[PDB]
Design an enzyme around this catalytic site. Structure first.
Site, PDB file in Angstrom:
ATOM      1  CE1 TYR A  78       0.850  -1.022   4.488  1.00 32.86           C
ATOM      2  CE2 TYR A  78       0.535   1.338   4.477  1.00 32.86           C
ATOM      3  CZ  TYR A  78       1.010   0.201   5.089  1.00 32.86           C
ATOM      4  OH  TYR A  78       1.641   0.354   6.302  1.00 32.86           O
TER       5      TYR A  78
ATOM      6  CG  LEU B  75      18.027  -0.982   5.618  1.00 32.39           C
ATOM      7  CD1 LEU B  75      16.626  -0.845   6.164  1.00 32.39           C
ATOM      8  CD2 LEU B  75      18.464  -2.419   5.749  1.00 32.39           C
TER       9      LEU B  75
ATOM     10  CG  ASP C 108       4.289  -9.399  -0.873  1.00 33.26           C
ATOM     11  OD1 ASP C 108       4.356 -10.200  -1.823  1.00 33.26           O
ATOM     12  OD2 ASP C 108       4.239  -8.175  -1.076  1.00 33.26           O
TER      13      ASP C 108
ATOM     14  CD  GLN D 116      11.033  -7.816  -6.546  1.00 38.26           C
ATOM     15  OE1 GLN D 116      10.658  -8.734  -5.794  1.00 38.26           O
ATOM     16  NE2 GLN D 116      11.359  -8.040  -7.810  1.00 38.26           N
TER      17      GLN D 116
HETATM   18  C1  LIG Z   1       9.842   1.896   3.767  1.00 35.23           C
HETATM   19  C2  LIG Z   1      11.003   1.148   4.418  1.00 35.23           C
HETATM   20  C3  LIG Z   1      10.641  -0.309   4.723  1.00 35.23           C
HETATM   21  C4  LIG Z   1      12.263   1.223   3.599  1.00 35.23           C
HETATM   22  N1  LIG Z   1      13.451   1.434   4.157  1.00 35.23           N
HETATM   23  N2  LIG Z   1      14.365   1.407   3.162  1.00 35.23           N
HETATM   24  C5  LIG Z   1      13.775   1.183   1.973  1.00 35.23           C
HETATM   25  C6  LIG Z   1      14.197   1.028   0.646  1.00 35.23           C
HETATM   26  N3  LIG Z   1      15.515   1.081   0.278  1.00 35.23           N
HETATM   27  C7  LIG Z   1      16.014   0.531  -0.983  1.00 35.23           C
HETATM   28  C8  LIG Z   1      16.098   1.617  -2.028  1.00 35.23           C
HETATM   29  C9  LIG Z   1      16.815   2.766  -1.754  1.00 35.23           C
HETATM   30  C10 LIG Z   1      16.931   3.774  -2.686  1.00 35.23           C
HETATM   31  C11 LIG Z   1      16.345   3.648  -3.944  1.00 35.23           C
HETATM   32  C12 LIG Z   1      16.409   4.759  -4.926  1.00 35.23           C
HETATM   33  C13 LIG Z   1      17.354   5.763  -4.847  1.00 35.23           C
HETATM   34  C14 LIG Z   1      17.323   6.789  -5.769  1.00 35.23           C
HETATM   35  C15 LIG Z   1      16.340   6.812  -6.733  1.00 35.23           C
HETATM   36  C16 LIG Z   1      15.412   5.801  -6.737  1.00 35.23           C
HETATM   37  N4  LIG Z   1      15.417   4.795  -5.848  1.00 35.23           N
HETATM   38  C17 LIG Z   1      15.616   2.492  -4.215  1.00 35.23           C
HETATM   39  C18 LIG Z   1      15.494   1.490  -3.268  1.00 35.23           C
HETATM   40  N5  LIG Z   1      13.280   0.765  -0.306  1.00 35.23           N
HETATM   41  C19 LIG Z   1      11.979   0.675   0.057  1.00 35.23           C
HETATM   42  S1  LIG Z   1      10.839   0.391  -1.243  1.00 35.23           S
HETATM   43  C20 LIG Z   1      11.916  -0.049  -2.639  1.00 35.23           C
HETATM   44  C21 LIG Z   1      12.340  -1.499  -2.573  1.00 35.23           C
HETATM   45  N6  LIG Z   1      11.314  -2.432  -3.073  1.00 35.23           N
HETATM   46  N7  LIG Z   1      11.495   0.804   1.295  1.00 35.23           N
HETATM   47  C22 LIG Z   1      12.418   1.051   2.256  1.00 35.23           C
END
Ligand SMILES: CC(C)c1[nH]nc2c(NCc3ccc(-c4ccccn4)cc3)nc(SCCN)nc12
Ligand SMILES: [Br-]
Ligand SMILES: [Cl-]
Lengths: 258, 288
Positions: free
Chosen positions: B15, B81, B125, B129
């Site tokens: 969500y 992270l 899930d 990813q």
């Molecule tokens: C909400 C909480 C649980 C959370 N803490 N760290 C998170 C994280 N870190 C990986 C990431 C970092 C930067 C990028 C990034 C950096 C620059 C531009 C675009 N993307 C992408 C993934 N990702 C996500 S959702 C994408 C993965 N399915 N949720 C995260």
């Protein structure tokens, strides 16, 4: 038994102490009484039946109301708004298909608006600090049922009936933890139907002897004997159904010899 | 919310939308998970993610730091992270990932999972990813929007659970009950995926999903899974493929890794290894 049955039991034990509401909170409530809480809870049993909600959902809703009223004063005309939001949150937590807000508003006969129910929801969440995963009597019972040798469907329904009766009366059941009430309800049901007693394997698992259960049992036995006279009757009427094998019609024993 | 500077959108999940942001006062880089509240009030996915993650304090589960209800929105503040497992695997698609890192990651995910399960939570899930890696070499379970507190014993829960590629055969064939075993299946698929850097069972429908499982593991019958041919969505016209040898399917794996993977991918949920039992498997002998 499933994989984590012991680890889960131990954890639920730790959580039930943290999720317990204040034993004497109704004394400190200027405008509501135990009798008004009993009327509220009994109405939610009806709501549960009407929308075909799980018994777990009802037990959680009551735990949210008790924790909410342990820290907030509430006027009598807003008590049913608290209960309604609590039931809405319990349903979203526990049910696959919760009823919708509009339906919860309808069962209060438009005493409250949709906007009031959603704001009460936010307030309840904030007051409870979003801690919704509370141990109930129900969760303990179903674990305890795995120690029946052999399973007896009359015992299981009667134990659920007694467990659910305890939600109606804040005095005295607020003084007991869910795992204790479930032990008392299970022993009383077992004794009423088969004449057997709280088994050796549950003493081992729970650390509770009959002796440790006795004060609650004395209380629950009186609740059971006086149940046909209780001002609130939804639970009793519900466990007349054949789904629960009519266990609410069974005769309670006259004494427990404890 | 005035304390946070949004830097950029980083993903979606179960969500809402997820943003990288910086606490202006402390300097801490966080992840903000946003829900707009505009009809049923707070979504059950949010109510569940929040209540459960407040109990789940463990070094291999992502940390929930705060919940802020601003004007028409709900923001969950989480540790950030820097990377997810999927991206990490794509960037190693040619060299490979060394087996000791795979072992460590798997060992850590199993610790996070055993914690959830011993605390009566199903994730439902698990996919690369939703597995996040920090600069320290730690991996962590994330996105508990589809998770649920389960009972002992379980009742029937929601049927439409787990991303297709990671979804257990007992869900696909329509069992009335499922439990901790669905999470282990998912991890089995991920274990295999780290080794080959490609999804083990990438189906494009429910039936095609089963067929991809069957082609690799052999078509289940009453020998391997008692009751399977009676299940709601089982069809006698399913093709009967023979099971493939794991040293062709995941060649880098040693003896112990093949045995572990086998036990995580058992057809019958009652034979499938638990997370806690997996932590004791000899494969984790020499884990870093
Ligand atoms: C909400 C909480 C649980 C959370 N803490 N760290 C998170 C994280 N870190 C990986 C990431 C970092 C930067 C990028 C990034 C950096 C620059 C531009 C675009 N993307 C992408 C993934 N990702 C996500 S959702 C994408 C993965 N399915 N949720 C995260
Ligand atoms: Br500032
Ligand atoms: Cl390979």
């Amino acid at each position: 038994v499933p994989d984590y049955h012991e680890d889960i039991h131990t954890y639920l034990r730790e959580m039930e102490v943290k999720c317990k509401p204040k034993v004497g909170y109704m004394k400190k409530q200027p405008d509501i009484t135990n009798s008004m809480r009993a009327i509220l809870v009994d109405w939610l049993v009806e709501v549960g039946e009407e929308y075909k909600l799980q018994n777990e959902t009802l037990h959680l809703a009551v735990n949210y109301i008790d924790r909410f009223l342990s820290s907030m004063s509430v006027l009598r005309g807003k008590l049913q708004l608290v209960g309604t939001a609590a039931m809405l949150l319990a349903s979203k937590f526990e049910e696959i298909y919760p009823p919708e807000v509009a339906e919860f508003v309808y069962i209060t006969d438009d005493t409250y608006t949709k906007k009031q129910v959603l704001r009460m929801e936010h307030l309840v969440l904030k007051v409870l600090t979003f801690d919704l995963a509370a141990p109930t009597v129900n969760q303990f019972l179903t674990q305890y049922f795995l120690h029946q040798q052999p399973a007896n469907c009359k015992v299981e329904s009667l134990a659920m009936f007694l467990g659910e009766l305890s939600l109606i009366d804040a005095d005295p059941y607020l003084k007991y933890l869910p795992s204790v009430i479930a032990g008392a309800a299970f022993h009383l049901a077992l004794y009423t139907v088969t004449g057997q007693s709280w088994p050796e394997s549950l003493i081992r698992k729970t650390g509770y002897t009959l002796e440790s259960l006795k004060p609650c049992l004395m209380d629950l036995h009186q609740t059971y004997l006086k149940a046909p006279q209780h001002a609130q009757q939804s639970i009793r009427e519900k466990y007349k159904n054949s789904k629960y094998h009519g266990v609410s019609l069974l005769n309670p024993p006259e004494t427990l010899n404890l | 919310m005035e304390n946070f500077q949004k830097v950029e959108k980083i993903g979606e999940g179960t969500y809402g939308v997820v943003y990288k942001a910086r606490n202006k006062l402390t300097g801490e880089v966080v992840a903000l998970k946003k829900i707009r509240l505009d009809t049923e009030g707070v979504p059950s996915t949010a109510i569940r993610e929040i209540s459960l993650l407040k109990e789940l304090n463990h070094p291999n589960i992502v940390k929930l730091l705060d919940v802020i209800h601003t004007e028409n929105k709900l923001y969950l503040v989480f540790e950030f992270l820097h990377q997810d497992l999927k991206k990490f695997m794509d960037a190693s698609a040619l060299t490979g990932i060394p087996l000791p890192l795979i072992k460590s990651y798997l060992f850590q995910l199993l610790q996070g999972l055993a914690f959830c399960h011993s605390h009566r939570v199903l994730h439902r899930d698990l996919k690369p990813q939703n597995l996040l890696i920090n600069t320290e070499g730690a991996i962590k379970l994330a996105d508990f929007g589809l998770a649920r507190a389960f009972g002992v014993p379980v009742r029937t829960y929601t049927h439409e659970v787990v991303t297709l590629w990671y979804r257990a055969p007992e869900i696909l064939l329509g069992c009335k009950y499922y439990s901790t075993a669905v999470d282990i299946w998912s991890l089995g698929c991920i274990f295999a995926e780290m080794v080959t850097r490609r999804a083990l069972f990438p189906g494009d429908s429910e039936i095609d999903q089963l067929f991809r499982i069957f082609r690799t593991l052999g078509t289940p019958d009453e020998v391997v899974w008692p009751g399977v041919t009676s299940m709601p969505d089982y069809k006698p016209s399913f093709p009967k493929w023979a099971r493939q040898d794991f040293s062709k399917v995941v060649p880098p794996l040693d003896e112990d890794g093949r045995s572990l993977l086998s036990q995580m991918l058992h057809y019958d949920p009652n034979k499938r290894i638990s997370a806690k039992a997996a932590l004791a498997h000899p494969f984790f002998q020499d884990v870093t």
